[PDB]
């Protein structure tokens, strides 16, 4: 339906993360991904956890930090065609329960996978470079900055 029929927000996207049951759905999605990975016979538990962390971090990066804009036409005349979803969230307020939860959960997953990976070096470097890739953009200093002009336009 048209944007603005039943609410006055120019960008509904900014609030999709504060809705009811979204956090529980996110957690259940991570759990379902983990179970689907466990369903593979030849794969071993430490590399299962490495794959869980890698796939989660890749998808979360793609959605939160790669895709920019709004899927629906918005009546604010294009505030956020250049902004990504993380920048759009909560109209640019840097801290919020949603942002704190979203930036805390990858670290918890990293601790769990470090425990279950038997502290191996190869897995450690993979998981840590992935965690850095996710966590570097979350810094308030890196708001609306494109390194080497990637995804600016």
């Amino acid at each position: 339906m048209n944007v603005g029929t039943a609410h006055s927000e120019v960008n509904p996207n900014t609030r999709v993360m504060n809705s009811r049951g979204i956090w529980l759905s996110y957690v259940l999605a991570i759990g379902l991904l983990h179970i689907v990975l466990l369903s593979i016979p030849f794969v071993s538990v430490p590399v299962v956890w490495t794959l869980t962390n890698l796939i989660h971090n890749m998808g979360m990066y793609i959605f939160l930090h790669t895709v920019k804009g709004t899927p629906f036409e918005t009546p604010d005349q294009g505030k956020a065609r250049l902004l990504t979803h993380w920048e759009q969230m909560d109209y640019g307020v840097q801290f919020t329960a949603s942002r704190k939860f979203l930036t805390i959960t990858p670290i918890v997953l990293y601790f769990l996978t470090s425990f279950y990976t038997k502290y191996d070096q190869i897995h450690f470097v993979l998981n840590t470079v992935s965690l850095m890739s996710v966590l570097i953009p979350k810094l308030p200093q890196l708001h609306g900055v494109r390194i080497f002009g990637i995804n600016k336009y």
Binding site: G92, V93, Q94, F95, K100, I107, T128, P140
Partner: protein, 44 residues
Amino acid sequence: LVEMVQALYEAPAYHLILEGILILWIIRLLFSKTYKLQERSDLT
């Protein structure tokens, strides 16, 4: 419990350093009560 402690003891030092700095980061985030607006302006 005990097995977890032994497994943590078996790990290198840089890994525990990283985990400690990360838990410190989590504490800082969870106690970052300030909510900035991220706006820049000056009078003309």
